[PDB]
Amino acid sequence: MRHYEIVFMVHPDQSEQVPGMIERYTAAITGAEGKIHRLEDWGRRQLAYPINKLHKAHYVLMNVEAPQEVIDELETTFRFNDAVIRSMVMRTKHAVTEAS
Amino acid sequence: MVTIRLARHGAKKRPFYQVVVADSRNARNGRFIERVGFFNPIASEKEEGTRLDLDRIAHWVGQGATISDRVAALIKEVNKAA
Amino acid sequence: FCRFTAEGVQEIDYKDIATLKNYITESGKIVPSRITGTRAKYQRQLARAIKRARYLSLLPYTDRH
Amino acid sequence: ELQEKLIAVNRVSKTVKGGRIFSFTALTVVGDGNGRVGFGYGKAREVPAAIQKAMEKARRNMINVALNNGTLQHPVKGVHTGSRVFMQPASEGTGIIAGGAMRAVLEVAGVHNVLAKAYGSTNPINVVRATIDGLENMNSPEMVAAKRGK
Amino acid sequence: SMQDPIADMLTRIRNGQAANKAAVTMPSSKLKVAIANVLKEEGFIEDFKVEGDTKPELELTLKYFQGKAVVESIQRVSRPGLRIYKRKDELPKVMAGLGIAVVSTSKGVMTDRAARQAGLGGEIICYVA
Amino acid sequence: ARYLGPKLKLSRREGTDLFLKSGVRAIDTKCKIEQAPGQHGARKPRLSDYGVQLREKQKVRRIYGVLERQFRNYYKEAARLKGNTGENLLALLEGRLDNVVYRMGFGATRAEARQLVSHKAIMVNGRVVNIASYQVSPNDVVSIREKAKKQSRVKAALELAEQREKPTWLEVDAGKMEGTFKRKPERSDLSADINEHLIVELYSK
Amino acid sequence: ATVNQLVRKPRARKVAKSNVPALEACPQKRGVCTRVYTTTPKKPNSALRKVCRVRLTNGFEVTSYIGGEGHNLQEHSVILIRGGRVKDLPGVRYHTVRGALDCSGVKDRKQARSKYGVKRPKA
Amino acid sequence: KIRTLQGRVVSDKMEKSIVVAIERFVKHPIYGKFIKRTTKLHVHDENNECGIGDVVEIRECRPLSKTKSWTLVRVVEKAV
RNA sequence: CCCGCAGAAGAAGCACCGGCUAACUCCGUGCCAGCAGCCGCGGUAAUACGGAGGGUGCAAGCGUUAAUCGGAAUUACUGGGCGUAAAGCGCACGCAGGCGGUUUGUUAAGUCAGAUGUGAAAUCCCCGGGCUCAACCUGGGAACUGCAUCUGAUACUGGCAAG
């Protein structure tokens, strides 16, 4: 029941499938009695540097108030999944729902 | 004669026989009572080129509406499943 | 002077990118506080935020990628 | 940086003992690109000097306009002298449409999508600042909340 | 032959808010006190009051924020010369909804905002912005 | 129904690269590109607003090899389509089959692409297509037929297409003469200098 | 402009009829020439302009400017009237069609070849 | 109930029959005013009870002469 | 429709280039000859006439004329004005007609909400499908802004009664 901040990239070739992953993450967190504080998709923004060749990955933001274990299963999903690259998770002090 | 017959609504060399409840004394493509289905002799592989409306055409033929030879062949063709 | 002692900012948000474009020189290096006049309270959490944004590749490590 | 653009240059004249003396008049508009515009009208005996006086006057008596992100906040009509102006906010998928005289003063403002039509007199000198009227009293919901209470 | 008390009183608002007077007065009727209450609710008039019994008068007082008047564009729409009647969904949004249109609907009088969420139109009175 | 005249006149009028040549020679060496063609090319333009809008339209039409009636129909379709009509026009323009052949580099120029399409030489989803203006849907496999396969034309085309920017919305297979139109491109990919809003204004008048 | 006045009588706009009664608005007519004239123009211009007075098969009789460098039209010839109004000459509102029917095209013309009825030379 | 309609009787001297003003208060299509427009309806009755100064309720019936396609069923306010 | 033969071999014109409006120089002519949609060009140094070169715009089409809408808010319902630009009858009464102070009660015509029937199909729009694509053909939906009926609301107007 602590506040976390997730940003994850998607390989550009699976851009059409990303809201399904988003819904599946929200379904899992609501089943684990977590909630969503902000969800917004950034499109395919241009990278500063190519990673595993490529450019213009699909950026996704999320703010989650959650127990730790379901998030831990979530990073294991990010590691196992190849359609996701370059994930990053974060602690924040309180819940946040702002712009940018 | 209230009947059910065919109207070539397609183009030159590409027919589309809209099968319609029409009075027989009218023109083939003009006045009618009401559309019931369509046939396509030049249809693609995905079998959507033929459709009817079974209970409505049953209502007309129970009302006394005759049918033509081609639509008789097509009701024999759709049968119930194939 | 320090821009962040104005505006009452609680913490520098790493997803705020245009401000970091102003505080990162064209090489990609973090500027010293001795030039900007930023308070060291906010310089530390600032440079952390560039290191976060760099991980997301919103900011380049260098101009030779 | 404030996006100087010429609108129309005209030749006017004065009659004296010697005859006619012609003088050049230039109209221009400046503004950064977000809620900041100012028009200038300047005359000189030569064209480049005329634009120089006009734009130097334009970098003066600027006026502020309350916008949305890229558009107007409500329909407004702008009436000055003989010119009449009508303008609407437009969708983000729309470009900005107006007369050539209005395109400069709207483009330097930072709107990208305005439905704008000129009625009647369409001289540039009155059509601009017929546009500054209307933009001078564009109104925001927060400001009318300050007016009323909600 | 004064033939529109509502137009008369709306012009009392216009003249008072032009000459920056604190109060305006006019004779009284139920349509006037209703639209006065609507202006009260939407914050264009901060006090209205009904006095008298043999000849009832209405006194309204006026709002000024930075010296300039608060209401800036008030216009009667549906006139004795021409009547305007509007159904539920074609009700307008004054100044893209920033201003208001006051309307006399079948269940009473309210603004366009209240009428459109209650799902009924009617004899539209005037625009205020 | 195609220009079939001198291309560097067009490039020399536009002042920039219109990508109408293979690229094996420097453009400045091939033509003296800095001024317009003809006797009076060296003078100042002082070009009008209608002039610059016209020049941008002429530029995009001469890049994509499209005539006015077709490109007008492209505008009508783009304005018909939802979204930003300005990049909708470019999205329709990038769906052309000869444009696809050039973007995968099966032709040294888009004129080679057009000739190769017209000469019954591209197999698309197992169907050969003679139509140069054929609109390509996403997830489409295009291929070169067994005829004209391993021809010096397409070999040199690939070997001079390796030096390009390798577009992200296509998958290339240079050993099998196969390609995949995976997505329609976006405006951010394409040359960064097409001023589509000028075409929008010129046709809105 | 009051609504009751407009209910009593609606808005009435004049038709502002056509500049040419070439009749039934036909793009061309054919006619028999009454007489070739050579006429002086309006004040700012000076010329000896070649005009024809022609009797239409409709029945109307009007003037038609004879365009181009020279012409070989004589009496009773049948020509094609087109339209288009000439501002130097008051009273004429029409043009002939060169190269059509009895009217010959302009001799040895190279540019603007179509509008003066000349065949394309060998090149 | 049956399709019925109401109106002012204008004629009086009409033999076992009557003509009625049918006012309709309709909006103008262009200039928007609700204008008083009336029509005359040529109506049947037995032994000629009603007269001028009356409002009557009529129904469309089968033709009895030309235009004669209404019958009155009810009479109200039979006074000046 | 699919395959094979031969070789670039059998296939490019039209209008325009003074401003409006993208494209300019030379020669001939010299208020002549002529152009011209409006402004206007031409009377011996014409980017406007004619020819050439060059350029521009379209393209198996290209121009002119013809016709209708728009731009024209230039008949202005949306959306115009009447001191001097065109416009207040010379001035009054005055029937019809348009509008009308203020409350109560009634009615529900106008008005407004809902429901039903209907507004042929085709056409337009949108999501699909097929002709190598397109035009074209075509499924479904949406619309058809209408009319009529019936049930309700009575704030305002209209009607009535009482002040």
Q: Which residue has the tokens 């821009």?
A: C3
- What was the experiment behind these coordinates? cryo-EM
3-state SS of chain E is: CCCCHHHHHHHHHHHHHHCCCCEEEEECCHHHHHHHHHHHHCCCEEEEEEECCCCCEEEEEECECCCCECCCCEEECCCCCCCCEECCCCCCCCCCCCCEEEEEECCEEEEHHHHHHHCCCEEEEEEEC
Distance CA F191, CA D11 (A): 42
E58 phi/psi in degrees, rounded to 5: -120, 130
**Contact yes or no for A49 and C65 at CB 8 A:** yes
Spatial strand order of the sheet with A2-10 comes to: A35-45, A57-66, A2-10, A84-92
Q: Which CATH number fits domain E74-128: 3.30.1490.10, 3.30.230.10, 3.40.50.150, 3.40.50.720?
A: 3.30.1490.10
One domain, residues F53 and F102: no
Residue B22 β-bridge partners: B3
* Among F34, F50, F51, residue whose Cα is nearest residue F42: F34
Which positions ≥6 away from E101 have C-beta within 8 Å?
E77, E91, E92, E93, E94, E111, E112, E124, E125, E126, E127, E128
Residue given tokens 């049948």 in the structure block:
G78
Q: Which residues pair with residue E49 across a beta bridge? A: E59
CB contact under 8 A, C59 and A48: yes
Closest CA of chain C from A3, distance in Å? 16
Q: Cα–Cα distances in Å, from F49 out to D31, D112, F34? A: 20, 18, 21
Angle at F113 between CA F199 and CA F71, to 5 degrees: 20
Q: Which residue is nearest to nucleotide I98 (CA to C1')?
A: G4
Q: How far is D94 from chain E (nearest CA, A)?
A: 18
* Rounded Cα distance, E69 and E65, in Å: 7
- Of the candidates D94, B31, D104, the one whose C-alpha atom is nearest the C-alpha of residue F197 is D94
- Exposed e or buried b per residue across F96-131, where buried means at least 16 C-beta atoms within 10 angstroms of its C-beta: bbbbbbbbbbbbbbbbbbbbbbeeebbbbeeeebee
State whether F83 and F141 are in the same domain: no
Which nucleotides of chain I have an atom under 7 angstroms from any protein CB?
Answer: 2-4, 12-17, 20-25, 31-43, 50-60, 62-68, 72-77, 80-82, 97-104, 109-114, 120-121, 125-127, 129-139, 149-157
Tell me how far apart the alpha carbons of residues F138 and F182 are, in angstroms, rounded to a whole number.
5
Residue E34 CB burial class (10 angstroms; 0-12, 13-18, ≥19): middle
Nearest to E65 among D74, D141, D146 (CB): D146
User: Is D64-148 CATH 3.30.230.10?
Assistant: yes
User: In Å, what is the CA distance from F125 to each residue of E126, F28, F140, F154, F179?
Assistant: 64, 41, 7, 20, 11
Q: Three-state DSSP class for A6? A: strand
Element (H, E) at A4: strand A2-10
- Closest CA to I77 C1' — which residue? H31
- Determine the 3-state secondary structure of A29 from DSSP: helix
- The Cα of H28 is separated from the nearest Cα of chain G by a number of Å equal to 9
E contacts of G4 (beta carbons < 8 Å): 81
The per-residue DSSP string of chain D comes to: ----EEEEEEEEEEE-SS-EEEEEEEEEEE--SSSEEEEEEEEESSHHHHHHHHHHHHSSS-EE----SSS-SS-EEEEETTEEEEEEE--TTS--B--HHHHHHHHTTT-S-EEEEEEE---HHHHHHHTHHHHTT---HHHHHHHH--
Give the HSE-up count for residue C44: Cα atoms under 13 Å, Cβ half-sphere. Answer: 2
Tell me if chain F has a CB within 8 Å of the CB of D149: no
CA distance G51 to G66: 5
Instruction: Provide the CA F1 to C1' I9 distance, Å, integer.
Output: 20
* CB atoms near residue B73 (< 10 Å): 11
Give the contacts of A91 (CB within 8 A, at least 6 positions apart): A2, A3, A4, A5
Q: Which domain holds residue F146?
A: 94-180
Domain span at H10: 3-79
- Whether residue F133 sits in one domain with residue F59: no
Dihedral over Cα of G12, G13, G17, G23: its sign:
negative
Residue D72's Cβ-count burial label (10 Å; 0-12, 13-18, 19+) is buried
Q: Is residue A83 part of a domain?
A: yes
- Which CATH number characterizes residue F69's domain? 1.10.1050.10
Interface subset of C 3-32, CB within 8 angstroms of A: 13, 15-16
Q: Where are the beta strands (DSSP E) in chain G?
A: 29-39, 49-56, 61-65, 78-81
Q: Which residue's CA is nearest to the C1' of nucleotide I74?
A: G13
The 3 state secondary structure assigned to F6-39 is: CHHHHHHHHCCCCCCCCCCCCHHHHCCCCCCCCC
Overall number of domains in chain F: 2
Contacts of G103 (CB under 8 A, 6+ apart): G71, G73, G77, G79, G80, G96, G97, G117
Lookup: tokens for G55? 């009797």
The count of other CB atoms within 10 Å of the CB of residue A48 is 19
Judged on CB neighbours under 10 Å (0-12, 13-18, 19+), F88 is buried
| C-alpha neighbours within 13 Å on the C-beta side of residue A99 | 0
User: Cβ of residue F58 near strand I, that is under 7 Å?
Assistant: yes
Only one residue has tokens 């009284």, namely E28
Q: Tokens 């309180």 identify what position?
A: A94
Residue F43 covered by a domain: yes
- D→E interface, C-beta within 8 Å: 73-75, 89, 137, 139, 141, 144, 146-150
> Residue F67 CB closer than 7 angstroms to strand I?
yes
In terms of DSSP H, where are the helices of chain C? 18-23, 33-36, 40-55
Cβ E44–D148 below 8 Å, yes or no? yes
Angle between helices F196-204 and F68-80 (to 10 degrees): 90
Contacts of F82 in chain D (CB under 8 A): 93
CA distance H27 to chain G (A): 12
Identify each DSSP E strand in F42-182 by its residue range.
122-124, 127-128, 140-144, 170-173, 178-181
- Of F40, F23, F41, the residue nearest F32 (C-alpha): F41
Provide the pairing of β-strand D76-80 with G49-56: unpaired
Reported resolution, Å: 3.2
Cα distances from B39 to residues B6, B71, B82, in angstroms, run 9, 9, 15
Sorted by where each begins, the domain ranges of chain E are 5-69, 74-128
Note whether B3 and B68 are within 8 A (CB). yes
Interchain CB contact of D47 with F (< 8 Å): no
Architecture of the D3-63 domain: 2-Layer Sandwich (3.30)
Q: Is F112 a member of any domain?
A: yes
Residues 6+ positions from G91 with CB-CB distance below 8 Å:
G63
F101's CB contacts (< 8 A; 6+ apart) are F107, F110, F113, F116, F117, F122, F142
Query: At F171, is the secondary structure helix, strand, or coil?
Result: strand
How far is B60 from B71, CA to CA, in rounded Å?
Answer: 13
Measured from the Cβ of residue A90, the count of other Cβ atoms closer than 10 Å reads 12
How big is the CA angle at G75 (ends G72 and G77), to the nearest 5 degrees? 75
CATH code, residues E5-69: 3.30.1370.30
How many residues are there in chain F? 205
User: Which residues from 37-56 of G have any strand I atom under 7 Å from their CB?
Assistant: 41, 44-50
Residue D23 CB partners (closer than 8 Å, separation 6+):
D11, D12, D13, D14, D43, D44, D45
Task: Record the tokens describing residue F105, joined without a space.
Answer: 């580099």
Residues F36 and F80 in one domain: yes
- Give the C-alpha separation, B41 to E1, whole Å: 80
CB B21 within 8 A of CB B2: yes
User: DSSP 3-state assignment of H69?
Assistant: coil
Q: Which domain holds residue A84?
A: 1-92
Among G60, G59, G69, smallest CA distance to G94 is for G60
Beta-carbon neighbour count of residue F202 at 10 Å?
16
Q: Chain A contacts of F186, Cβ < 8 Å?
A: 44
Which residues 47-106 of chain E have a CB under 7 Å from nucleic chain I?
A: 80-81, 83, 85-89, 104-106
State how far the Cα of D1 lies from the Cα of D25, in Å rounded to an integer: 24
Question: Using CA atoms in the order H12, H13, H18, H20, what is the torsion angle rounded to 10 degrees?
Answer: -40
Q: Which of F165, F203, F177 is nearest to F101 (CA)?
A: F177
Do residues E121 and E115 make contact, with C-beta atoms less than 8 angstroms apart? yes
Pair F160, F199 in one domain:
no
Burial group, residue A53, by CB count within 10 angstroms (0-12, 13-18, 19+): exposed
